[PDB]
Amino acid sequence: YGDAIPEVKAILEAKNEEELVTFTSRWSAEERKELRTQFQDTTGLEFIAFLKKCIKNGPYEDVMALGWDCNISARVNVIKKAMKNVNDFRAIHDVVLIATPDERLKLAQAYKEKTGNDLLQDFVDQIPLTSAASYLCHLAIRENRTPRGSVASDAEVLKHNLIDADEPDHEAVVRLIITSTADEYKEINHRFEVLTGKSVQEAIETRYADKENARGLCIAHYYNLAPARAVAYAFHSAVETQNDDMAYEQAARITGLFHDLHKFAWVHYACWGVMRDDILSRFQSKEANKVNFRDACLMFWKLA
Numbered sequence: 001y002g003d004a005i006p007e008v009k010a011i012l013e014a015k016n017e018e019e020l021v022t023f024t025s026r027w028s029a030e031e032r033k034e035l036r037t038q039f040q041d042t043t044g045l046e047f048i049a050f051l052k053k054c055i056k057n058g059p060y061e062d063v064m065a066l067g068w069d070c071n072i073s074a075r076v077n078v079i080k081k082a083m084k085n086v087n088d089f090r091a092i093h094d095v096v097l098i099a100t101p102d103e104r105l106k107l108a109q110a111y112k113e114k115t116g117n118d119l120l121q122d123f124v125d126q127i128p129l130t131s132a133a134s135y136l137c138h139l140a141i142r143e144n145r146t147p148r149g150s151v152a153s154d155a156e157v158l159k160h161n162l163i164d165a166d167e168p169d170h171e172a173v174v175r176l177i178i179t180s181t182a183d184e185y186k187e188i189n190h191r192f193e194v195l196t197g198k199s200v201q202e203a204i205e206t207r208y209a210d211k212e213n214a215r216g217l218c219i220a221h222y223y224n225l226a227p228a229r230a231v232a233y234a235f236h237s238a239v240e241t242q243n244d245d246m247a248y249e250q251a252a253r254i255t256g257l258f259h260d261l262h263k264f265a266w267v268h269y270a271c272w273g274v275m276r277d278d279i280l281s282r283f284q285s286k287e288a289n290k291v292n293f294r295d296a297c298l299m300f301w302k303l304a
Contacts, residue, residue: 001038003115008035009043012054018114020055025299029260058289059248063296065255072103072110074257079111079119083126089133093216094253096140098230098262099225104141132213135174136220145181155178155191162203164198177220181212185224201233222268232268235275239282245272248283248290251297258298266303276303 004023011019012280027035036047041051048065055061066074073097081186082091099107100253111119120141148154157176161168178190192200200221208214217238231254238250258265269275276298283294 001035001085003287004035005039005042008039009045009116012051013054015054015149017055021057021091021295021299023195024064024296025304032082033070033123036068054059058287059252060250060289060291060293060296063252063256063293063300067254067259067300069256071257071261074107075103075107076110076114078253078257079107081120087127088248089212089216091253093133093138093212093219094234096137097216097219098145098227098234098258099140100151101144110142121220129171132170132174132211133210135171136216139174139178140220143175143179145179147181147184148179151184151187151191152198154188155195156266157158158192158203159196162186162200162207163198164302168207173217177217177224180224182224189221189225221265222225226268228262228265229268230291231262231265232271232275235265235269236272237277239272239278244285244287244290248293251283252293253298255300259302263302266301269284275301 004026006109008020011023012122018183024032033206039045048069051068052065055064066078070220071075072160078095080190082088082095095107096104108119111117111134115122120138123138123141127136127137129138154176157172176186189200192198196203204217205214208217215234218233218237219230222233234254235251238247238254241247241250244268266275269278272278278299279294283290283297285291285293295304
């Protein structure tokens with residue numbers, strides 16, 4: 001790290017976003033953490049804040065700042081930003097839906113240590129229970145997965161609420177999905193497809209006109225099938241977003257949080273296209289804070 005510290009300090013001082021990408025590519029998660037520690041010991045500067053001070057704000061900065069951090073710290077930062085003003089359910093969902101029970105516990109602990117408040121209590125105070133999106137937030141952190149031995153009837157509950165009913169029972173749908181074991185859910189999913197001739201994704205996206213709602217339910221659904229499939233869907237949802245500010249914001253977060261943990265998202269993305277090719281095609285902005293995002297994104301996903 002002795003040579004690498006002055007190397008990256010100089011890259012940052014030059015605002016050389018291109019070289020920052022290639023520099024970052026050299027290091028494992030364990031090495032990034034060690035490098036930040038030594039960087040601060042040697043230079044007196046906390047690495048992430050210095051990176052943000054040097055690199056102009058936007059999605060390129062976001063992907064780098066999230067990607068260089070420890071994953072749980074990154075998640076805490078994302079939740080706080082998401083809840084500061086109008087709740088950004090897309091960001092909260094990414095954090096709490098794409099999470100093992102242990103990741104959930106570690107997030108709760110880190111969030112309490114950082115903010116002095118329990119995550120669940122902040123959800124209680126700041127997220128009224130109305131929409132599917134709101135129920136996903138609360139139930140994701142409250143409820144565990146347990147077998148029910150009712151695969152046929154659970155598939156019927158999904159058909160009834162997603163397709164047949166005048167209005168879905170949002171809480172019942174969220175509870176069903178969030179509390180399903182992976183084994184039972186694979187079976188529920190198949191039975192739903194047989195019963196309806198539709199994918200669960202299609203049924204959700206047809207029913208829920210609010211994009212945050214539809215997206216969050218699809219993430220929870222896909223997580224049950226495979227964690228990296230939820231990540232692939234979320235990435236797809238970013239790619240197909242017409243508004244560049246939003247598409248790049250979402251892609252930066254998803255990449256920063258999940259590029260290592262869910263490295264095989266590209267396997268599941270193949271449903272929609274070749275992930276490498278779509279990153280290249282989609283992220284072509286000339287805006288200064290976006291121009292180098294594509295290359296950062298490819299690097300973090302090992303698709304360069």
